Amino acid sequence: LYFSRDAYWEKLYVDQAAGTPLLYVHALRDAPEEVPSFRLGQHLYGTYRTRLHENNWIRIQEDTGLLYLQRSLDHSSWEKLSVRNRGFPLLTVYLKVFLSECQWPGCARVYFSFFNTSFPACSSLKPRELCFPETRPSFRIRENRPPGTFHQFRLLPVQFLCPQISVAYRLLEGEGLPFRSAPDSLEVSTRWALDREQREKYELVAVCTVHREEVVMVPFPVTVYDEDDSAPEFEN
Amino acid sequence: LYFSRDAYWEKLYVDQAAGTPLLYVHALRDAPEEVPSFRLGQHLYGTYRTRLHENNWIRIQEDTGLLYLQRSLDHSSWEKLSVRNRGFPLLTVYLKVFLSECQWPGCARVYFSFFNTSFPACSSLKPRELCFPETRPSFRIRENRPPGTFHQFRLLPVQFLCPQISVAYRLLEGEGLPFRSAPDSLEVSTRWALDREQREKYELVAVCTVHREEVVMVPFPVTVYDEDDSAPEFEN
């Protein structure tokens, strides 16, 4: 089994409610019977991999790969983490996610940009921030390995705190291609095994419709990996 | 052998001359006859450990642990690195430094904050920026292992580009303590083996005198490690 990304990212605010869902990770199969079992590392990490504190706040669903807040992060929580960050401003905190050192394919790092404020007002959010993470993701899919779900598009803290904003997604430029994003689906999956001899790189278009409708589009890149090698491929 | 820090940091600018010296790393001994031999990883890394490019610019002196620019980083160099950073703004780039996955005690990560400008005018620099890195370092020294040099204070790009600014350093609060920073020395060393049963943590004061004299002081923390365990200790 391997993650379809080496790194994930979202934002965390002061005083987000226990019960906020954060994002999903995804593991694809190396053999047909493989089933992921997700678990978190024990600690939260800050600047230059500083070990900050035991993670008392974030949990993952072992079967489905959903990360969520088990306990709210209040002002004091963020202070405990800040003071352990070796003098650097606390800008980012991350966790490790194992699927059965933290390195792809067996471990993903989930990064959260900390914002010292409340989650913003719903009405303040522009379509780009409602639709996709701040930097669009790219994906890793091994040739000649079984197809499966490798992404989910909806921003979970936005769907949770702003449930009155409707958001929908589709792909462009995937016709004839192995990718499925079905009507009303927030998931993206492959349809058949990939093969680097046919295509090494895909670049689809992800399209988000918010609401009066407004649309935002971003590239959707997928690199086809070797069945076996662990080394990251360059991305351009 | 082990590094006396897990992470190092400095700044890099556009168009710094080939031949700029950057900083030293230091490896202390686990047994009396051990001698480090330093080598760099093959690549430069950017945000969330993105593998950016082969490192064509920075070299290290294998015996002494001096990192320096073998080739200037011009506007185009920084563009090659930026475009490989997976859509994230290029703020930090790092290298791995092996002494015989990159994890203490055998591997240190050296981080450079990239500033898209020329190195600043010498006359613009305040004493704090002339004296110490932006976030002060802290050190790791194993109990019951041989003493040795574990830090060097002078900021090498500043000494190189601003040689008309005199800078000197000493410690306070080390009397009776195992630390030596000698008159006119820019190095700090231990004098005898440490022992966690006597002291687990030291917090000295590093004092820099610039030039008319102005002085800046910063804490100088040292954590005493187990002779054997690799796990980072929390720092407060």
Short mmCIF file of C-alpha atoms in Angstrom, two decimals, chain A residues 6-7 9 43 48-49 51-54 83-84 86-88 92 94 101-103 109 111 113 135-136 138 140 231-232 234-236, chain B residues 6-7 9 43 48-49 51-54 83-84 86-88 92 94 101-103 109 111 113 135-136 138 140 231-232 234-236:
data_model
loop_
_atom_site.label_atom_id
_atom_site.label_comp_id
_atom_site.label_asym_id
_atom_site.label_seq_id
_atom_site.Cartn_x
_atom_site.Cartn_y
_atom_site.Cartn_z
CA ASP A 6 3.60 12.38 0.42
CA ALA A 7 2.35 15.62 2.07
CA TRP A 9 -1.95 20.47 4.23
CA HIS A 43 3.73 13.89 18.53
CA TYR A 48 12.73 22.30 11.24
CA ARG A 49 11.12 19.06 12.60
CA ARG A 51 9.34 17.65 18.37
CA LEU A 52 6.76 19.98 20.12
CA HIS A 53 4.32 17.89 22.24
CA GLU A 54 2.29 14.70 22.37
CA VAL A 83 6.95 27.57 23.58
CA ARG A 84 8.30 24.15 22.56
CA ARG A 86 12.86 26.29 19.99
CA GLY A 87 12.44 30.08 19.53
CA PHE A 88 10.98 30.01 16.02
CA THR A 92 3.20 25.28 10.79
CA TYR A 94 2.60 18.59 11.35
CA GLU A 101 11.37 8.38 9.85
CA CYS A 102 8.28 9.54 7.85
CA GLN A 103 8.73 9.02 4.12
CA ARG A 109 3.12 14.18 6.70
CA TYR A 111 0.90 19.99 7.68
CA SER A 113 -0.69 26.38 8.93
CA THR A 135 -1.51 25.39 -2.94
CA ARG A 136 -3.22 22.82 -5.20
CA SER A 138 -0.56 16.79 -6.90
CA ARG A 140 1.39 9.83 -6.94
CA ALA A 231 12.37 7.97 -4.59
CA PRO A 232 10.25 11.14 -5.23
CA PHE A 234 10.66 15.86 -9.74
CA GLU A 235 7.58 17.91 -10.46
CA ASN A 236 7.46 20.91 -12.82
CA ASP B 6 20.04 18.50 14.43
CA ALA B 7 19.28 21.64 12.36
CA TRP B 9 20.12 27.78 9.46
CA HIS B 43 19.77 17.46 -3.70
CA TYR B 48 7.30 20.03 2.85
CA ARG B 49 10.53 18.16 1.83
CA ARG B 51 13.00 17.33 -3.79
CA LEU B 52 13.87 20.48 -5.90
CA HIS B 53 17.13 19.92 -7.85
CA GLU B 54 20.63 18.47 -7.67
CA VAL B 83 9.51 26.11 -10.25
CA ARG B 84 10.31 22.69 -8.77
CA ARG B 86 5.25 22.14 -6.30
CA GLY B 87 3.42 25.51 -6.32
CA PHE B 88 4.52 26.71 -2.90
CA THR B 92 13.40 27.95 2.58
CA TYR B 94 17.74 22.79 2.80
CA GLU B 101 16.31 9.67 5.86
CA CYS B 102 18.11 12.62 7.59
CA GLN B 103 17.89 12.39 11.37
CA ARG B 109 19.64 19.47 7.97
CA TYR B 111 18.18 25.34 6.21
CA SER B 113 15.89 31.28 4.14
CA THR B 135 16.68 32.39 16.00
CA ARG B 136 19.46 31.55 18.48
CA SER B 138 20.66 25.34 21.01
CA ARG B 140 23.03 18.58 21.96
CA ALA B 231 15.17 10.51 20.27
CA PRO B 232 15.08 14.38 20.44
CA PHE B 234 11.88 18.52 24.36
CA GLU B 235 13.20 22.03 24.71
CA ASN B 236 11.50 24.82 26.68
#
